[PDB]
């Protein structure tokens, strides 16, 4: 008796997984109680796409936010002059918001929750390599042109 699991089931659960168990455990508990279902192909050899409709489908044809670094890296100069003053310094600081904000192409919109900067960009002005770290391994790179007003 295999039957595909449907929940936790102590020493054997996966909200969907086949496992050889005593028919006494099934048709008496692991079943008639909502916890499993016989492996009659129609629920596996035919209902296996459910397990292949994500990591193998909604993880490959999920074309949408995968081309981050590619979609964003050729912007129209993200000039973000964080002001300046007092012997050539800065009035404005660099943060997570302003960065992933001014980095908007054609009136587009970017969440500030996608930044690639270890610490806080101290007040300077020089080349600011502000990479657009969005997805885990799928991040991007942008820039900022801090100066004055």
């Amino acid at each position: 008796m295999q039957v595909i699991l449907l929940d936790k089931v102590a020493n054997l659960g996966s909200l969907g997984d086949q496992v050889n168990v005593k028919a006494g455990y099934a048709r008496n508990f692991l079943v008639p109680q909502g916890k499993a279902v016989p492996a009659t192909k129609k629920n596996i050899e035919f209902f296996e796409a459910r397990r292949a409709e994500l990591e193998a489908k909604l993880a490959e044809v999920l074309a949408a936010a995968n081309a981050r670094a590619e979609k964003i890296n050729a912007l129209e100069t993200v000039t973000i002059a964080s002001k300046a003053g007092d012997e050539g310094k800065l009035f404005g600081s660099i943060g997570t918001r302003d960065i992933a904000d001014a980095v908007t192409a054609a009136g587009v919109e970017v969440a500030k929750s996608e930044v690639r900067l270890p610490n806080g960009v101290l007040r300077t002005t020089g080349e600011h390599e502000v990479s657009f770290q969005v997805h885990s391994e799928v991040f991007a790179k942008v820039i900022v042109n801090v100066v004055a007003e």
Binding site: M1, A23, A26, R27, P32, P38
Partner: protein
């Protein structure tokens, strides 16, 4: 009436055939234990006079495929 009910396995007769080969009608009878099944689809807890092995059938064909028949021949349930 001591009938498998699901596979119509009635009690057949035979000989004891003790040592020395001595005839003596004995008759064998099915297992049966009248089980409590959960049709689920029908949302009912139907019970049948199912017998061993004949129970393996339900777990092989279908509690509904079985009830499909049975009710087909015009049996209770």
């Amino acid at each position: 009436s001591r009938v498998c009910q699901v596979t119509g396995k009635r009690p057949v007769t035979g000989n004891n055939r003790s040592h020395a080969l001595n005839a003596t009608k004995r008759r064998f009878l099915p297992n049966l234990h009248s089980h409590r099944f959960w049709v689920e689809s029908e949302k009912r807890f139907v019970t049948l006079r199912v017998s061993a092995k004949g129970m393996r059938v339900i777990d092989k064909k279908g509690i509904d495929t079985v009830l499909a028949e049975l009710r087909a021949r015009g049996e209770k349930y």
